[PDB]
Amino acid sequence: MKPYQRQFIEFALSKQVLKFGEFTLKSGRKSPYFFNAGLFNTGRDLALLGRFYAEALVDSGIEFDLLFGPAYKGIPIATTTAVALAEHHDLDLPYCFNRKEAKDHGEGGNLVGSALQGRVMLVDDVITAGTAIRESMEIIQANGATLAGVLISLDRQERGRGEISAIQEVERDYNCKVISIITLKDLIAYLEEKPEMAEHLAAVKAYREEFGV
């Protein structure tokens, strides 16, 4: 993996976003690890998070005109990623996010920020079943914009309800590329680096054997 990807795993572990134990996922599966991006819940965590998103985005080489974050979890992510693109990559990008219902006052509709136009980069944390993307895609399409990509923190690389993963479902359903800062493959690689992580390594590898794509 690239250095920033190893650093991102180290960051997620340090802020207790990446945890090990016995978790029940939205699907009902029992997983030995869980990535709870909601625990990036301080200003330093947000600052670094945006920097890691921005690095992954620039690394991908995908061209885009605007960053969109879905209400609610996407709003801080899009904000900090936009800041980091300006502060650390000499890129001053429009951002946008939605409100779940229109205000009484004014004609802003359901959008906040810049006009929703051009090639949109959608930011998200972890795709489980694609619902936040679906709501977002309906908004992107209704505004005449296109989806340049979806940028997420972690691709768990595991089956959805059927044969393909949730990320592969989004890629097919919305005909797009999903960019991830890290994957399950990267997590497994990181866990090979120190003997203290060997129990977690075995558990995560067993999970991949059962559910990985």
Added chain:
Amino acid sequence: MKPYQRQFIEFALSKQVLKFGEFTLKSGRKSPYFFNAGLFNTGRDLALLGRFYAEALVDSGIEFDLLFGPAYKGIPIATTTAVALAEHHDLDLPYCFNRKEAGNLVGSALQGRVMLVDDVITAGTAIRESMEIIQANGATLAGVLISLDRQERGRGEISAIQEVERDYNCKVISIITLKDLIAYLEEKPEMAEHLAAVKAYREEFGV
């Protein structure tokens, strides 16, 4: 004024956040100027916005444990302010925001002395609702920080900021005030007509 205040006025003008013309405010008053923080809508705008909020916060000296932004406008403001505190002031603050439709909170636990951040205060509705939430969690209100204090009357004798300050015994601070805007416009010969209109508005509605 302080350098960050002059720079914030210049920046707001350059991004059309501060604009002149004829606007109808939430109060129905016809104002010759309007401050729309929602037009700080690019990454550079957001980066600098948070710096300006962070500078006003540290300048105030108010002690606080957590930054809260009311949904929706306060969410990006609190986010970028928290980023700038960490990146430019070596201060790593918990942040929080609510879901407007109303569990109802995102971010760090709502505890301790909370600094609210908002764009403007018109009637005090976002603060009233946010204060309900903050006090219901046992937290206290360290302050409210806004971009611009328009220094105008509310429905009665006092301003909406003064209502907030008294109703909640809390401190409201602002990056800039109308008095700062007037001081700046007095320096710019090309803004003389705008200045006159703003001064006439202040004569009618100023507190």
